[PDB]
Amino acid sequence: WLGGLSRAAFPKRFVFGTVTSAYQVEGMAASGGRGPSIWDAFAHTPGNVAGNQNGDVATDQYHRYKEDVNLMKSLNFDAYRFSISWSRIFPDGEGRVNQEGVAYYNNLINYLLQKGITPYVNLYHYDLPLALEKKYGGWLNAKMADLFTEYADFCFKTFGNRVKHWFTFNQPRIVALLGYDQGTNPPKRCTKCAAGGNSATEPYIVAHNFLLSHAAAVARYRTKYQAAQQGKVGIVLDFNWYEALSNSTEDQAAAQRARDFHIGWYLDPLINGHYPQIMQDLVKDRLPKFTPEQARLVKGSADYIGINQYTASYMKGQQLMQQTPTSYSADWQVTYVFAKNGKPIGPQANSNWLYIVPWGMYGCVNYIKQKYGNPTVVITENGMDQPANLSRDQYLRDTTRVHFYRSYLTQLKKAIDEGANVAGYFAWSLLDNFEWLSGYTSKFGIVYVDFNTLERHPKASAYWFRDMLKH
Template sequence: MEQKGERKNDMDWVLSLVIITISLALPLHVSCSDVYSRSDFPEGFAFGSGTSAYQWEGAAAEDGRKPSVWDTFVHSRNLDNGDITCDGYHKYKEDVQLMVETGLDAFKFSISWSRLIPNGRGPVNPKGLQFYKNFIQELVTHGIEPHATLFHYDLPQALEDDYGGWLNRTIIEDFTAYADVCFREFGSHVKFWTTINEANIFTIGGYNDGITGPGRCSRKCSSGNSSTEPYIVGHNLLLAHASASRLYRQKYKDMQGGSVGLSLYAIGFSPSTSSKDDEMAAQRARDFDLGWMLAPLTLGDYPYVMRRSIGSRLPDFSEEESELVKGSSDFIGIIHYLAAIVTNTKPYFPGYSDYYYDTGVTSSYTCNITTSQCSVTPWALEGVLEYIKQSYGNPPVYILENGKTIKGDFQLQLKDTPRIEYLHVYMGAVLSAVRNGSDTRGYFVWSLMDVYELLGGYGKSYGLYYVNFSDAHLTRSPKLSAHWYSAFIKGDATFLGSQGISQLQSNFSSSSL
């Protein structure tokens, strides 16, 4: 217990460098009194939800699956784990029925590399292959569009042990071979492929802060180099994505007709004052957050400000690599939860370089990852979409994660009105961005059900459906937000706006679940 407590303090120390909780008294473009319906969105706009393999599947040691770096990370630190979690591996048919009842158009999930190819390279695991075929078929049979992610934080531990995983360019070849298996085996039904989930934040968490697997950093970690490794890993992620995308276009696209994209964690940055220095700092923060990956994907190289700040620590693209990466994403997946106010300063320690120091800014965030207390700032999501439209050629965008955690007892979990109010204003912000010309094509609520959260274990609850983790059957129960989201998707305007939400809550309270 003492070691676990010490580790938590270490993680809090790292987070405290980055996260300062504030409340923003800024006007919202959409309020809960505003009424809009699904019909206000463009035809074909997808409303969905999602989970990921390690957070939902469980069955961590069953049917040939081998450990990923996330298994190793949480078990070595005595943290909550996903060994069982929702047991989606066995209960996937039941969960697809929940999707059907909710009326989802689409579902975002990830494929566990170490379940499909346990050693990361070499033979395919037939039981893992069959599970994903069965699950995808179940989705398609019920009219739910599969959105598959190839990598969601869970690199096979075997590749980490063999050559250092994402730090080694060998990963590009192995990731492309893994993608080839997925495209070949599942591509007749899967038309939307995300190569890397949250490519930027995965890199920062795992190789700068050390708070996610594989847990590498310069300070408070047993190994790592925060001044160089984030940029090496980010470079290899981009090259692996581009290699898989090229493979799809050359070998599968004409036959399968799908698309391949990259997912990024997007923060809405605003300057703390109207000074030129702070406005430039906010732009610098955007370049480091989104431009780090979006500039190579659209222009073939990193932003100039990153080159100037990081210098030789930032890898170079060869001419061939630049052409490979440029234009390699058919769409951009956006993960959004928070905003930040930016000040032009040099934080932290003189003579110490890491990702945050390189940005040259101090950011005060609207969400504290440790406590999960967040301000509601839908304008930030609208601003991100507008920025991508103006700065990066208005590519197709899918909001692949957005949601709110609710803490409390069972009844508070089920009557999650604050989550409904949150979703209402954020979906309204997306609608506003679309009306202003953003090519945003879908919105996915995180998450379909309560799952193992990568940074919060089982202490956080984002689900539309409650999961009783104390029950051997892991019983699922709809929350008020599940009823609201279902009504919205199905075009029932009765429960839209503040009065409708109150009516829905009244109906929910009088019904038996």
């Protein structure tokens, strides 16, 4: 049932935790003085989210955080990854501070420390203050570095004496892709989109600014707060594994382009101070250039790399063509493939994009180890969802999720046993929550949340964790 897994099976002092994010669990979207984010607007627009749901109440952790902390402690977790709502601190993203908001995260951090749980804090998780979107054009504007840096500065000043583990951003790739390529996330921009946009150029502008913003914030931390606070700052990048369909040159090349356009996009700048060669070759003048000083500032600017790992795909190649630019996605010139040798790569969870493929966990960790000089990596997210409409009892009986973590974790142990620098592992998610476009129709939590009463009940997987992590 534990499949031989336990704390003894991982390096001494390895960190185990669970994850949530502000908008997804806090609730009190329009109270305690909080200002609206782009997701509030988006979520309140009919047709944007399943069943027209939003995060107004969510799991209402804003009121039940202490219950939740007690829960995670009794599950034997060492750490908790959560995010800070920019607009809860700065209703307008700049200027006036919301004291009540500060009070909240103060109370949360203190209670966590009081109960022996280590805070791992994200500064940003999709929730850009609406006011900044309307006034500056959001991440399309280089001015975001200043704005984000001032925001980071206040956090370091205000919680830095107790928070020692920071993350700046969360999956800037999904922002760029879904927000500016496909236009399915706020600000819903893309070539054909009603809000305007350009899927061939904007995705790259956005990513560049994320990187610059990250570097600026880390520069500020390192020059102003690090000495006294002795903290760390990393960044969270999603990485789904890409496997060559066959052993042909063509297919091997494809899988690697996919890797480079997926994770290299951000890792090459962060580790090597430049975008991947292939991207420079293919995207050309649509890819912004880093000035030498910007590159020098970007390179080395992450104390650890958070990887959000979920799934894996087969990749098929093809002769590279000279093409009219249309989209960041089309720039890869690769073909996604379903099965190999007539077998599917793995079964699917509730989410159509989530294929259960344990060995992809190993692919990713190992690849970053081999290709990037083995930097310190943290698995910042890993888990799967159940569908909506099951009975309470069916949720609590998540045998599939139990098998998911046992397998994935076994694969993580294999990569680690082979010398990979993984410092920690975080399960997404602690609670069933607001799953963006899917609203409340997708359940990722190891703890069940009844969205009528908001009661918590731990699932089998919660108990599986409690067993596996006992001291």
